[PDB]
Amino acid sequence: VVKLVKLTFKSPVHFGMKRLSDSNHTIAADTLFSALIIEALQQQLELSHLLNNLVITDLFPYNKTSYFLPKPLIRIEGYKAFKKLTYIPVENYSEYLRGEIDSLEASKIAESLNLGKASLSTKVSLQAVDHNGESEPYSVGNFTFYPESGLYFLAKGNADTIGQLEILMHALQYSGIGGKRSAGYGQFRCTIEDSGKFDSLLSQTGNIAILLSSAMASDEELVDCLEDARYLLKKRTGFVQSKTYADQLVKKKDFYAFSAGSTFYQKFNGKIFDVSDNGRHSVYRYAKAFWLEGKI
Amino acid sequence: YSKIRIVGKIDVLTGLHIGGSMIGAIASPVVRDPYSRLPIIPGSSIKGKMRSLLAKHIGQDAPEILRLFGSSQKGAIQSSRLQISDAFFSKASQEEFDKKDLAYTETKFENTISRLTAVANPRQIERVTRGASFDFHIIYNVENINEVMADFENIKTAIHLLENDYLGGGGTRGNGRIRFVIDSIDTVVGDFDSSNLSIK
Amino acid sequence: NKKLELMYGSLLHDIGKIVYRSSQFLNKFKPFQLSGIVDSVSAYITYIADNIASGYTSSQYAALVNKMTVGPDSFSSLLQWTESLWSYIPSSTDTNQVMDVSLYDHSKITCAIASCIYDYLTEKQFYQEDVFLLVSLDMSGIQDFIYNISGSKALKSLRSRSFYLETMLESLVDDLLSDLELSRANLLYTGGGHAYLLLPNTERARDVLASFEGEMKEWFIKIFKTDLSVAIAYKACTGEDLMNSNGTYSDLWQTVSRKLSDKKAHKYSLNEIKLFNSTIHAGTQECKECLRSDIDISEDSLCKICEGIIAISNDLRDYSFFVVSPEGKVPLPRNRYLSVENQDGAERKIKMNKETRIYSKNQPFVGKQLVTNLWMCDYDFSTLNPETKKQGIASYVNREVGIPRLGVLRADIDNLGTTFIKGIPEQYRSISRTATLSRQLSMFFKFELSNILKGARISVIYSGGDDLFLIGAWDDVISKALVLRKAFTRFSAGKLTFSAGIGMYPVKYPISKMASETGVLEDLAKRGEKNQVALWNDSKVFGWSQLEEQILKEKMIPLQEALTEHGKSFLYKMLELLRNEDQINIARLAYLLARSSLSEELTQSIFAWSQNKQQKVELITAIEYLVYQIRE
Numbered sequence A: 001v002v003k004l005v006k007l008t009f010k011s012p013v014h015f016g017m018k019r020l021s022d023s024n025h026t027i028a029a030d031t032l033f034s035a036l037i038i039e040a041l042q043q044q045l046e047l048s049h050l051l052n053n054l055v056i057t058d059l060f061p062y063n064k065t066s067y068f069l070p071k072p073l074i075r076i077e078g079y080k081a082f083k084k085l086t087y088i089p090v091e092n093y094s095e096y097l098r099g100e101i102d103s104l105e106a107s108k109i110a111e112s113l114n115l116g117k118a119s120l121s122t123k124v125s126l127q128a129v130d131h132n133g134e135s136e137p138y139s140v141g142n143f144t145f146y147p148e149s150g151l152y153f154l155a156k157g158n159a160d161t162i163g164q165l166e167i168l169m170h171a172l173q174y175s176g177i178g179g180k181r182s183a184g185y186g187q188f189r190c191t192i193e194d195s196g197k198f199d200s201l202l203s204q205t206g207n208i209a210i211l212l213s214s215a216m217a218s219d220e221e222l223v224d225c226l227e228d229a230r231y232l233l234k235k236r237t238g239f240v241q242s243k244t245y246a247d248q249l250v251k252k253k254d255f256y257a258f259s260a261g262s263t264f265y266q267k268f269n270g271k272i273f274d275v276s277d278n279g280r281h282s283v284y285r286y287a288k289a290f291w292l293e294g295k296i
Numbered sequence B: 001y002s003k004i005r006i007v008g009k010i011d012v013l014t015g016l017h018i019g020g021s022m023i024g025a026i027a028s029p030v031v032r033d034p035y036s037r038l039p040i041i042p043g044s045s046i047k048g049k050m051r052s053l054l055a056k057h058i059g060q061d062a063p064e065i066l067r068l069f070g071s072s073q074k075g076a077i078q079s080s081r082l083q084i085s086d087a088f089f090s091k092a093s094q095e096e097f098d099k100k101d102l103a104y105t106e107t108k109f110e111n112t113i114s115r116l117t118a119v120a121n122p123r124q125i126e127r128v129t130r131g132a133s134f135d136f137h138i139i140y141n142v143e144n145i146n147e148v149m150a151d152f153e154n155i156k157t158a159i160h161l162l163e164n165d166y167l168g169g170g171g172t173r174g175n176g177r178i179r180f181v182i183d184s185i186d187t188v189v190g191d192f193d194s195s196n197l198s199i200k
Numbered sequence C: 001n002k003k004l005e006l007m008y009g010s011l012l013h014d015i016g017k018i019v020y021r022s023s024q025f026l027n028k029f030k031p032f033q034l035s036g037i038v039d040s041v042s043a044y045i046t047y048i049a050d051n052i053a054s055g056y057t058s059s060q061y062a063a064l065v066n067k068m069t070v071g072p073d074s075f076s077s078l079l080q081w082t083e084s085l086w087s088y089i090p091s092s093t094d095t096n097q098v099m100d101v102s103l104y105d106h107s108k109i110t111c112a113i114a115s116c117i118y119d120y121l122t123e124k125q126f127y128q129e130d131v132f133l134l135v136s137l138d139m140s141g142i143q144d145f146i147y148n149i150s151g152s153k154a155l156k157s158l159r160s161r162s163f164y165l166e167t168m169l170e171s172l173v174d175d176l177l178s179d180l181e182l183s184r185a186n187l188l189y190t191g192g193g194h195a196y197l198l199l200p201n202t203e204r205a206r207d208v209l210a211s212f213e214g215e216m217k218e219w220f221i222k223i224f225k226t227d228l229s230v231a232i233a234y235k236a237c238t239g240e241d242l243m244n245s246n247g248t249y250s251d252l253w254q255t256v257s258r259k260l261s262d263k264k265a266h267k268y269s270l271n272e273i274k275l276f277n278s279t280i281h282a283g284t285q286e287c288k289e290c291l292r293s294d295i296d297i298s299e300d301s302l303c304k305i306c307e308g309i310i311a312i313s314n315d316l317r318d319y320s321f322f323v324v325s326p327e328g329k330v331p332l333p334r335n336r337y338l339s340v341e342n343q344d345g346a347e348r349k350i351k352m353n354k355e356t357r358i359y360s361k362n363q364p365f366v367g368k369q370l371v372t373n374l375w376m377c378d379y380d381f382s383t384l385n386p387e388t389k390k391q392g393i394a395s396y397v398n399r400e401v402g403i404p405r406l407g408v409l410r411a412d413i414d415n416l417g418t419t420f421i422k423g424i425p426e427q428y429r430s431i432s433r434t435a436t437l438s439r440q441l442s443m444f445f446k447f448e449l450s451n452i453l454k455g456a457r458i459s460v461i462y463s464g465g466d467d468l469f470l471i472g473a474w475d476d477v478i479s480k481a482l483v484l485r486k487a488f489t490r491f492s493a494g495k496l497t498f499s500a501g502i503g504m505y506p507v508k509y510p511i512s513k514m515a516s517e518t519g520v521l522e523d524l525a526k527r528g529e530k531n532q533v534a535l536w537n538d539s540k541v542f543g544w545s546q547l548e549e550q551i552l553k554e555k556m557i558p559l560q561e562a563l564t565e566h567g568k569s570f571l572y573k574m575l576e577l578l579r580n581e582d583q584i585n586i587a588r589l590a591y592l593l594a595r596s597s598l599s600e601e602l603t604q605s606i607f608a609w610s611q612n613k614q615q616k617v618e619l620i621t622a623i624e625y626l627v628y629q630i631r632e
C-alpha cells in the first residue's frame, strides 16, 4: 500500500552529501532508511518489516501548487536548460516523457519549483579556548524550506509495515532527520496520507522504467539490466553512526548506486547492501528499487 | 525509550546578538531565517552555552556533560540527550513589533578607544530589541530512566546559571541577557511521566 | 615512410605562394628536396586534400621569406614553425571570397585531411564516401575535481588541478595521436576540457579508438574513480560533409555532440559497476582534499595524487617545461607522470629514457627538438618579487592606501556554443573557420590574458577555454576586468560577450567560500540578458557600460577629485541619505549639499543622480568604491 508522507521542516536541515559546508535540499532513500533503522533500534522495535518488505523512495520536493518528481534521464531533441533542470511536476511528467516540454518550458519549470533558500551558518568550537588554545570556526550548510513547501516521499509495504513506519515517523518528528541534529537542525513534522494521484501515476504500464530511489541490484540482475539504459552513479559513503559498532568512528565500505530518475528498460529489484567492515553489527544501506512506468 | 519536549519562550532582557562587506552598514549582523528574515537563536548557541555553564559548575570530560550534550570519544560513544532547536521570533512578538512601527532588530552603535592613540573604532552591531520573544524547543532523550531526575537537576542548574549569564554576543558588555519561560515539559515520545519535572 | 613525406608535402604544398607574392624554393634546400614533398608542392593525395579543405607589404613578405630561408619525430617542430609564421598570411592571396582562412589553418587542415585520406587508402565520387571520423573527447566532473579542495592547501590545488587537468587532456590526445600514426595537426582543436579530432575512417582507427576509450576508462576508474571520467564519441563523415556541401557540417557537429551526451548517459560498463561495488576494506584514514580512503594516505592526511598536485603547484610557475615521463610527481595515463623542470632537467629526462614527451609553456621557439608548445596563462604578481612569492596572496592584500581586501573574478563567455554552431552563417561555415575561431579564443584566453593583466596584482587561478578565475587586489581585479572586457570587445569585433562576477573578501576568508560566493555572484550576473557584471553584493548587478563609465568615470572620479573641508564624514552622511531612499531623504540630501560647500556643478549632478532610480544605485556604488579606495 503506497502511502504519501509529507515532512514540514520547522528548522533548517543540513542533508549533507560530501562535506559539512554543502547542503542538499533532499536526501536519498538510503539516508531515510538508516534513520528509520536507528529510530527502530532506539524504540526497541522489530527490524523484520523494514529489512524485508519496505520499498521507499527518495525525498522529493513538494510545493503549494503541485508535487515534484525527479527528471527522467532520456534523450532530448538550449540543452543547457534541460541539463540544469532537475525536478518535474507530477502533472507535467507525462508531457516530459513524450518530450512536449521545450527548452523555454524546461527553464520555466526549473524556476517554478520553490523549495526554499540555501545558506551557510558559520559556527565555532570554543573547547580549546580555556585549554590555552583558540576557537575553531566551521560552516554548516542549511537549506530552509519555504513555508508552503516541504519534502514528501512514497513508501510501499504491508499494513503492519505501514503502521510500524507511522510509529517510526512519529518518533522521527522529534529525533530529527538529516545531519547536524541535536544542534538545531532536522526537526520536522510528519503527515502520512493517501494520495490518489500518486496511486494513479504509479499504476501504469509504460515502455521504460524510471527509478524513484537510489538503488542497486545483485550480480545477475545487474547483468540483465544495463543494456541501453541511461543512468548516473552516486557515491553513497560516509561514517558509521552508532554507539555499539566500534570504540571509534570508522567509515563504512564505499557504495555506488544509480540515481533516482535513471531510466532502465529492464526492471531490476534491489537488496539492502551490507557495508559493515568487520564490526559488531551490520551497517545496512538501502538499495531497493521503486519503479515508475513511463512512455517515450 | 522516551522523548520529553520542553517548549517555552526566551524573553530578551538586553539586545541579543548571536552574530553569524558593504561599507557603512551593519558590520556584525545577527543570524536570520533565510526566507522569513526573522532573527533566530541557533540551537548550537544554547547547547554550547549550557555545556560551558555545566563545565563551570560541575568542574568537558565530566560524565554528566559527556552524557547530556553528547560525545564521540574513543570507546565512550554517547548520544546527546539534549537536542535544542533554533529559537524563532515568536508570533506574538511579531505582532507587538509590527505595532509601534518597531523594527525587529536595532543597530547598536559601539566603539573601542585604544590604549595608545585613544582613537575610537566604531562598529554597528545588530541586536534583537529588548522585549522580543523567541520560541525555544528542547528535546530530552531518555536513554536511562534512572538518570532522568539527575539529568533534569543538571539542566535546571544550567538554566539557572544561564538566566544569570548571557546567551550570545559580548555579554560582559551587556548584550545577550535572557530569561527562560517554560510553557511545557510534557513528554512527546514514550510513556515516561514528566509531570514532576521542572526547569525553573 | 611515404606517410612522412606526404605530411611534409601537404603542410608545405603552398609554401611557394609566399615567395610568389613576396617548389623551387623548397628545392633550394637539400633536406626538403625529397621527391614526395616536392611532388606534393607542385602526389594526388595532396591535391585531393587541398580540394577537400578548400570546399600586405612586399618588403615584409621578403623578410618572412628570408627568415624561412625532415627526419622522423621532427614534424612537430615544423608544425610549430608553421603556426608561428603563417598565422597572419591569408590562405587565399586575392579572391572575391573573404580570406577567413589563414595560411597556417589551410596548411594544417590539408595535412590532417591528407593523412586521413592516405590511411583510408592504405586500408567527386570519393567525396561521397564515408572517409573521415569526427571524434570528441570530453572529461566529466572537471570543476567538481578542481573545487574539491582541502582548505590548508586549497589555493595551491586550485592553481594546479586545473593546470594538471588541462595537461592531462593534452597527454590523452597525444596518446591517441601516437596510436594512430598521426601528427598534432590531425586534431581540429581543444577547448577548455574538451578536444575535437579528425581521424581516418579505417578499421584500425576504430579499433584504436575502442581500445583507447576502454583503457582510459580503466585508468580513470583506478586513479580518480568517478570524479573524472573522459568520454570519446566518434561519427563517420563523408568528404562532402566536411566541405559544408548539402549543409551538413553543423549537422555533423551537432550529431557528434549528442552522441557524446548519450555516451555520457551510459558511462560505466557492467564489470566496472561490479568492481565498484566490491570494496573489501572500508579504510579508516581519509584524505583531506579528495576525501578518499581506499588509496593509501600519508601522515599529513594528503593523498598521493594530492601531494603530487601540490608539488606541481609549487613547480608550475618556477619552470616552463612539462615532462611526461616515467619519472615525475603526478600521475598520467599509460603509467606516466608529469613533472615541471628547467631546460637542463628537461634534456636530462629526454636523454635518460625514450618515449618521454616535452611541452614548452608559452615558448614560441621551434629550434628546440621534441617540444610541443602548450599555452597557459600563469600570471602571478607575487612570483615577480621573491618576498611576495614567499608571502602569497597576503602580499596582494598588503596595500599602503586602500581597504586591505581580496577580489575574486569568475568571468565566462556567453553563448559561445551558439556562436560556434549558429553564429557562423551557412555559406561561410567550414572546419577551417571553426579551427581558426577556436585557436583565436585559446590564444586570447591563454596568452593575451598575461599581456592584459601585466602590471597588476592578479593571480590567474585558471584561464580555461571559456571560464576564467582571477584573484588579487579588489581594485586591481575590477580595473583589469574592465580592461579585459574592452580588450575582448575589440578583439572579437563585437559578436561576443562575457559575464563576470567580482567579489570582495577579507584576507583570511576561506578560499572555498570566496569561490562559491563569487560563483553565485557571476551566476546572478549571467541572468537572462547576459553581458553583465555582478559587483560586490549579489543584489546589485550592472552592465559593462554602466560599470566602466557611468559608475566609475561619470560619478566616482568627480567625487575623488572633489574630496581630494571635504572629508570622509561628508561621504558617509551622503551614503546614509542615499541608502535610506525616501523622498524626504532626497530633500535632506539637497539641504546637506546646499550647506556642504561643494561646487554647484557637482552639487546639481549629485542631486540629479539621487533623483533617478538607476542613477541612485550607480551613485551609491561610486561612493562605496571611493570610500573603499580612500581607507587608511
Ligand SMILES: Nc1ncnc2c1ncn2[C@@H]1O[C@H](COP(=O)(O)NP(=O)(O)OP(=O)(O)O)[C@@H](O)[C@H]1O
Residues within 6 Å of the ligand: C138, C139, C140, C141, C142, C143, C144, C145, C146, C161, C162, C163, C165, C166, C192, C193, C194, C264, C462, C464, C465, C466, C467
Ligand atoms: N582544467 C580546467 N580548469 C578550469 N576549468 C575548466 C578546465 N577544463 C574545463 N574547464 C571548464 O570548466 C567547466 C567544468 O565543468 P564540468 O565539471 O561539468 N566538466 P565538462 O567538461 O563541462 O563535462 P559535463 O560534466 O558538463 O558533461 C567546463 O564547463 C568547462 O567550461
Ligand SMILES: Nc1ncnc2c1ncn2[C@@H]1O[C@H](COP(=O)(O)NP(=O)(O)OP(=O)(O)O)[C@@H](O)[C@H]1O
Residues within 6 Å of the ligand: A080, C190, C191, C192, C194, C412, C413, C414, C415, C416, C417, C418, C437, C438, C439, C441, C442, C464, C465, C466, C467
Ligand atoms: N577555447 C575554446 N575554443 C572552442 N570552443 C570552446 C572553447 N572554450 C569553450 N568552448 C566550447 O564553448 C562552450 C563554453 O561553455 P560555457 O560554460 O561558457 N556555456 P555556453 O555554452 O557558452 O552558454 P551560457 O551558459 O554562457 O549562456 C563549451 O561547452 C564548449 O562547447
Ligand SMILES: [Mg+2]
Residues within 6 Å of the ligand: C412, C413, C414, C415, C416, C466, C467
Ligand atoms: Mg560561458
Ligand SMILES: [Mg+2]
Residues within 6 Å of the ligand: C412, C413, C466, C467
Ligand atoms: Mg563556462
